[PDB]
């Protein structure tokens, strides 16, 4: 029928894409990096333990100054920490306690958060009176807010369980652009360094590269077996890593348009909740459901170290802009700084 | 001016920690509940008896309860349901094959690794609707549940005086359908509290209070290795 024609027409294109990707796969990354020296044993120690959250922590984000950071807990609080002195700078009560994401504006003047309320709330940190208050509530998503990232003080990109991503104008509060194409809940997004593109991972076991200016999906990446819970751009903007419930991390190249490396082990059978690269991109850090964080050699797919100082599920992790430290959040209501 | 800079930080951190102590007492005093149910299970009427998520507050015997119901969320629950791993109990409302779909959802909730320590308060709703269909006899449960034709009403059953054995055996069979799932696993970390309820019944709020008391009592007994 008419459905069979279009379904087969889509099937012919998937073979053409798979054949074109196979032609470019002349040699694998594991063979090109076979002659480089290994990073050895990476031994990081807990330098700071941030206490004060009442319930499980769902997200965190470093500030561009590599000193301040914001964390979101399902007790209904955003806490901004001074990681150097462990002092709390702000404690923001949330209208909805079921927060699932938080973001720190690059200027440092705003923070955002959202969750099961399907709203991305913007908070002004530089109020004249000195008390943080809601600056804008971004409504329009028909599903929970899973991730948000500021492009600037006026623009922010969000991902939602409604299978779509959106670009918002904070001053007007309207969706400037809506990114559609995913068939499952979008769980995470990561902005390119130049903020021209961004990648998103979803519960359809696929990752998509989006153009911010045009609003279309440039490329779609597959290879994972289950839902993608985390995504992070390589520092050069030409690659990105993903973490999935299939207990594996994978590295994808934009210009090659295919997976380059898989980071897995037989002992690991739990899903990955968060991923982040070191400053040089040599180290790929990943949080796991087994309460531990693994440090992978991004070039050689070998595990280099473990961050095992958490008593519950690691829900988020982040590397500072200067690359000096790594922060880990967990369901044990604590944030730890590793160095 | 190095000392004055760090001095204001310690003073600002002091005001924050003082506020966090007041919020800690309120957060630990409130018992949070997740209300789950089908579109036609009758849970909407129970909220009437007392956006992505709705909130309902009610107090029983000086105890505060915060009940949450999912609003504008897709039917794919495997991600957002993890946010409710720390609730006191999940209130699962079931209209007494829509019944098989509720059994499958209950099995996934009961066996989810993050919900393993979460007890479930099961509301077998639509008991008056269930009674009318059994008295008529047009639609037989045996067609959708073949093991019902060999089912026998348990001895520990406690039916109403004005109830025929056809309705007593029908509602208790549905209860055993869920109890088989709940007693198959758990190893004593969470429990299931089934209740034959109606949307207009006033004991519903009292039933949640009694089950929550039983949940907290068994949690204390577990902390002392007594049960």
């Amino acid at each position, epitope marked *: 029928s008419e459905l069979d024609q279009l*379904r087969q027409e889509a099937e012919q294109l998937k073979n053409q894409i798979r054949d074109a990707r196979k032609a470019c796969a002349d040699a694998t990354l594991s063979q090109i990096t076979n002659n480089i020296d290994p990073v050895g044993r990476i031994q990081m120690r807990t330098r700071r333990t941030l206490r004060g959250h009442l319930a499980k922590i769902y997200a965190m984000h470093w500030g561009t100054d590599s000193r301040l950071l914001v964390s979101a807990s399902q007790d209904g609080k955003l806490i901004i920490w001074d990681s150097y002195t462990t002092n709390k700078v702000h404690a923001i009560p949330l209208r909805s306690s079921w927060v699932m994401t938080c973001a720190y504006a690059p200027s440092g003047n705003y923070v955002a958060c959202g969750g099961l309320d399907n709203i991305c709330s913007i908070y002004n940190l530089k109020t004249r009176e000195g008390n943080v208050r809601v600056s804008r509530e971004l409504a329009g998503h028909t599903g929970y807010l899973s991730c948000c990232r500021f492009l600037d003080d006026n623009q922010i990109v969000t991902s939602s369980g409604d*299978t779509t991503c959106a670009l918002w104008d904070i001053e007007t509060g309207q969706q400037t652009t809506t990114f559609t194409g995913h*068939t*499952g809940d979008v769980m995470s997004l990561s902005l390119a360094p130049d903020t021209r593109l961004f990648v998103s991972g979803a*519960c*359809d*076991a*696929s990752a998509k590269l989006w153009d911010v200016r045009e609003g279309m999906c440039r490329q779609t990446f*597959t*290879g994972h*077996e*289950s*839902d993608i819970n985390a995504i992070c751009f390589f520092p050069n903007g030409n690659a990105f890593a993903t973490g999935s*419930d*299939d*207990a594996t991390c994978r590295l994808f190249d934009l210009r090659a348009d295919q997976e380059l490396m898989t980071y897995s082990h037989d002992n690991i*059978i739990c*899903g990955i909740t968060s991923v982040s690269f070191s400053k040089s991109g040599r180290l790929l850090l990943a949080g796991y459901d087994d309460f531990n964080c693994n440090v992978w050699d991004a070039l050689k797919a070998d595990r280099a170290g473990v961050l095992a100082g958490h008593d519950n599920r690691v829900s988020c992790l982040g590397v500072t802009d200067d690359g000096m430290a790594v922060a880990t959040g967990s369901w044990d209501s604590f944030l730890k700084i590793w160095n | 001016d190095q000392r004055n800079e760090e001095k204001a930080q310690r003073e600002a951190n002091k005001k924050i920690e003082k506020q966090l102590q007041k919020d800690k007492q309120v957060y630990r005093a409130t018992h949070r509940l997740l209300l789950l149910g089908a579109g036609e299970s009758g849970k909407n009427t129970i909220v009437k008896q007392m956006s992505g998520i709705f909130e309902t507050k009610f107090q029983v015997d000086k105890v505060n309860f915060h009940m949450f119901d999912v609003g504008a969320q*897709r*039917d*794919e*629950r*495997r991600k957002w*349901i993890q946010c409710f791993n720390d609730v006191t109990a999940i209130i699962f409302v079931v209209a007494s*094959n829509r019944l*098989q*779909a509720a059994l*499958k959802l209950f*099995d*996934s*909730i*009961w*066996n*989810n*690794k993050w919900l393993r320590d979460t007890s479930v308060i099961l509301f077998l709703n639509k008991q008056d609707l269930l009674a009318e269909k059994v008295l008529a006899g047009k639609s037989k449960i045996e*067609d*959708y*549940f*073949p*093991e019902f034709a060999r089912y026998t009403t348990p001895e520990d059953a406690t039916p109403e005086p004005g109830e025929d054995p056809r309705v007593t055996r029908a509602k208790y069979f549905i209860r055993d359908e869920f109890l088989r799932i709940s007693t198959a*696993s758990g190893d004593g970390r969470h429990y299931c509290y089934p209740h034959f309820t109606c949307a207009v019944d006033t004991e519903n709020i009292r039933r949640v209070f009694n089950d929550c008391r039983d949940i907290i009592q068994r949690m204390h007994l577990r902390q002392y290795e007594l049960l």
Partner: nanobody
Amino acid sequence: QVQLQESGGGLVQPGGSLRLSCAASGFTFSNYKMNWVRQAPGKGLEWVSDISQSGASISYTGSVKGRFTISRDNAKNTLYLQMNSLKPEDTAVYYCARCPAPFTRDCFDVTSTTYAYRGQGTQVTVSS
């Protein structure tokens, strides 16, 4: 990518037999619990049967107990459904549905209208 492709089905007289096949690819078949679901004309998706990873735990919906037989072959990465004594109410589009996560007892969202890890279905029509 994860791909599920069902085969078999068609027109069969009432009381006949039918065997469905589900060829899986793009994932470790042996690590996932498999399901069969169907959508009757005008009705919503409903769960039919499931089978554990090793094939030890097997369940059925009440309407097909004693008439449907589910089986899997992890070596060939295939899922089977042996339909015997078919009735007109069995007329539906049967889908091969994989549980979302491996090494899990729970199996969420397999009957959702937009579930990703589900095949395109095969039409089974039982009529005289």
